[PDB]
Amino acid sequence: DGEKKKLQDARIEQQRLLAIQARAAYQSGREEYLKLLLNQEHPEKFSRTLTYYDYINKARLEQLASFNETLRQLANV
Amino acid sequence: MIRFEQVGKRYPNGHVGLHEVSFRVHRGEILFVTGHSGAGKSTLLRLILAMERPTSGKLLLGGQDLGRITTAQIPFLRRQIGVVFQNHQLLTDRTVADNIALPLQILGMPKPEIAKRVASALERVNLKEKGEALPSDLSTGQQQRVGIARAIVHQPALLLADQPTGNLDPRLASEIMGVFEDINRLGTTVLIASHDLALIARMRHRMLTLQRGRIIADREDE
Amino acid sequence: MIRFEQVGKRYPNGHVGLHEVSFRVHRGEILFVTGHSGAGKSTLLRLILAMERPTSGKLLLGGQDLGRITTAQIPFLRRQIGVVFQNHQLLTDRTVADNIALPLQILGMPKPEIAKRVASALERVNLKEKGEALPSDLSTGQQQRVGIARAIVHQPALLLADQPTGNLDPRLASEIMGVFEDINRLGTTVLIASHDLALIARMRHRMLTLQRGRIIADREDE
Amino acid sequence: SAYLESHRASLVDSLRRLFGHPFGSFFTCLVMGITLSLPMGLSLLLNNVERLGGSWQRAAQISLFLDLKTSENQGQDLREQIERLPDVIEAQLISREQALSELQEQSGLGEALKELPENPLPPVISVTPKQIDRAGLEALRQQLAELPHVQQAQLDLVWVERLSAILKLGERFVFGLTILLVLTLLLVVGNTIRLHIENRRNEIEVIKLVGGTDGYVRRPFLYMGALYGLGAGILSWALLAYSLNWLNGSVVNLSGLYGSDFGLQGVPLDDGLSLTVGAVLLGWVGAWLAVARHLRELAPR
Amino acid sequence: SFSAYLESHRASLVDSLRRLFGHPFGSFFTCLVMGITLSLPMGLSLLLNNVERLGGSWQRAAQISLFLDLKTSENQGQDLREQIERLPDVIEAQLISREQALSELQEQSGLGEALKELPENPLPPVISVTPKQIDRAGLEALRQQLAELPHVQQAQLDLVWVERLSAILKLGERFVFGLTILLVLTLLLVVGNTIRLHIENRRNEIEVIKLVGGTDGYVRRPFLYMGALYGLGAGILSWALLAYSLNWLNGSVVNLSGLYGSDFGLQGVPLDDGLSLTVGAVLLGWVGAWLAVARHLRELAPR
């Protein structure tokens, strides 16, 4: 019915959102540790960013699990 | 008295400086030991001063033996000997009054009578107008004059020296010889060695002679 | 060529040793000077050396004057004159062979005649027993006649020396002053200073007498 | 009571000998001073840089994380718990909201939770042990990962063994340049003091043959060798004041740009007095060893 | 003559070695002092020449990153790689691709089981260029010409300490310039005091060879070889301590570089610099002996 368009538009925006996130993960995931002890930043910063990139990646798995599980019931004719 | 028994010194270089000697020194006795050029009487004076090893034999000076004696105690014996040696022991670039005063700072005697005593010695040796100067500011006879001034001060019990006025004229030296029996008239022992024989023939005294380190070359002329 | 005229060394201290000296010494003559303790003659022989300036008068030594002497011209004059002096010192902790041979490297001679000139001059010294030893190994009498034998070697044109027989026997003195006419048989100058009037009244001596810088006290006495 | 006049006579002769050719003795005063500024000048430099340690040569950080349910009183409970360990530096707790803010400004997006309606980010803690010696490598990381409520902790490029390799190179270079300079100091002084007194060797043997003692002959030379230490302790104090203020013209560029009030202390009076009396007692021992060789060289027996 | 000049040099040479063998405690004592002072300025200069070989770690921070858009093409990536290297104030420009950007996250904890949902890799390739110099303030003006490229997504610098790397560098260059002035001038004083005091020692032998003759070269000749052989003894005793020190500290640097994935350590010492070190010690004792004797010969000048 009309519920099949309301999941595919949510699918393509989170594909855009994961593309921006993985691009933003490539910014603060490439800094070396000689940039630490330096630039007025505490060493817990620039080291917990990549482990926070784990946390945003794992949290969207259950969102992608919930979107994919309701698509299979919606595909029944 | 000083008993002078058998002693003989062998140097480690291989030469025997003296073979045998034995003398007899009484209290207040005067000696005039003089031999030939090989006679080691100035070495014997170095044996008297006990800064040389006795090697063989035995040497006796006073109530203490000369041998197996500690190094820390022997300059106390050297303080009461007015040693005059032919190489001239004076401190360069100092005042001349300190050169007399070399035993005077040792014995602990007061300061305002130091200047009286150093003024006292200089007419006895007949040396005026040379006070408060360097030892380089003197004549060649005058370091011998302040050298014998270093011996006559404090009236030492044992006076040991060799050959005064060896370069100085015998006109002045007859008074310089004439001082020495006045020191000997007091209760002092003078063992002066005078290498010359012509001037000493007038004085009646005891003469000894050594030849090639032997005990007696010529008999006593007492 | 050695004539003194109106010269005298003033001292900066309160005493000046010499007042006035003016004398001429003929070539090939044996000279003797004498005086008392206040008389100045060691400065008179040092004036011929002139390691300090006379600061008065004009003095002559051959073609080149002693007054206004330069550093670049002095050691040619010093190397041709052999002078020994009474304050006896030598190269400590070496042999006595090269101590005699000290000016021979300065003038420059080959090796096989260095050693034979040592032994040829040492026979009159009576030091055949000690030819190669330390200066401290020698006697106090022996080390002056080593320095006398230093003046004998390589035959200097001008000789000054010092007061000899400082520690030598009166018997063995007669052989060393017998050497000084043998080395003055050719054209040299001999200026032995002596004080014993008994041994210097034998043959022809000029016999200059000094008292407190007064040169004119005795005649030629020939 | 003859000791007091003998000591005063030896001191006035030492100053009179020092005025004799004063250009030579002042030349020896400068050599004794400038080499003395090496192990004391480097001593204050290691006594200066321990005031700032958080932003220089120590930034050890471990990413120990909490569960999703976290209360802030439990975080400050664990902050004093890790302070019981002898090798830690800092112990602070970060919260849920401002940890979300700092990741957003780092990415520059600010759209972290506009999509998911619930918040999944755990409020975690900050364990920052910069005061470690770091030599235990990641085995120290494994011992500090032993928590019942921790989940996952990472350490890229292993980085405590790398912090060990920095600190092992730091300590061995300091101890390498400590022992070398003090053997440079103790041999330059010991050679120079001994080789003044080998000159004028005739003066010792004059008083020795007429008598004397070890106490009288030591007296003019004990005061001579100690006064060069007194001459060194003033001039080494002077050049240390000049070099520290010359370096002060460039440390204020780093201090103002970082943002701090960091001044360098120069010539303290407690250390300046101890620098002078260190050199004076150095000259006494070196002269005492020098005169004992001169007794043995011409011993009579 | 020339024959007398060579025999004067040879006899003064063999007397110096006989003097050197005499007093074996004292001759070895001043030899170590002559070496241990010299080991500091040449030793620290050998350290500074070895640290500057390691230049990749110092030129690793302040690397500029540029982000492409979603569409990826590698042929403009190599074009921008060679264009930055043509411009100055660079060392080398390197670019890793999306597959390299995919691969480097896979050993990491991020991007786990995410490419089954991703239709394509969205991570753009990046450039990473470090400037070869950090110069003075005003190096922030390179930002407007890196935005000149048609594909700029992020230019996320940390703007504060890029200028401040010009503060840490040249602080240490002035710090080592403080010690390379002070250690050289304390080398000239220790050598200049001991050699001059040797002329002040043994004073009695000069005047006894000056009044009988002699020149200034003959008296200086036993001291010139005395100054030279202690300088020759200085370079040997310097050589053993530097070889012991570089072997002692070589274990720490190979431990750091092996953890860093590099083959870096303390290198050896050259023979050409080894001969240059010893002839410096010979010439310093030779120059210092000439200035030492001029005071004593002027003291007893004929004038």
Ligand SMILES: Nc1ncnc2c1ncn2[C@@H]1O[C@H](COP(=O)(O)OP(=O)(O)OP(=O)(O)O)[C@@H](O)[C@H]1O
């Ligand atoms: N260290 C020594 N080793 C070997 N022999 C020595 C040593 N010291 C001195 N002699 C020897 O001692 C001998 C003579 O000694 P001494 O100096 O006392 O005689 P003298 O006093 O000079 O007699 P005169 O004064 O009339 O000449 C010398 O021939 C010398 O060889």
Ligand SMILES: Nc1ncnc2c1ncn2[C@@H]1O[C@H](COP(=O)(O)OP(=O)(O)OP(=O)(O)O)[C@@H](O)[C@H]1O
């Ligand atoms: N530098 C000086 N300053 C002041 N006076 C001096 C100086 N040198 C020597 N005199 C004095 O001048 C005189 C010089 O005597 P001189 O040097 O010529 O010794 P001399 O002729 O051999 O006498 P003597 O027979 O006693 O040995 C001495 O009396 C001495 O006191």
Ligand SMILES: [Mg+2]
């Ligand atoms: Mg004798």
Ligand SMILES: [Mg+2]
């Ligand atoms: Mg005289």
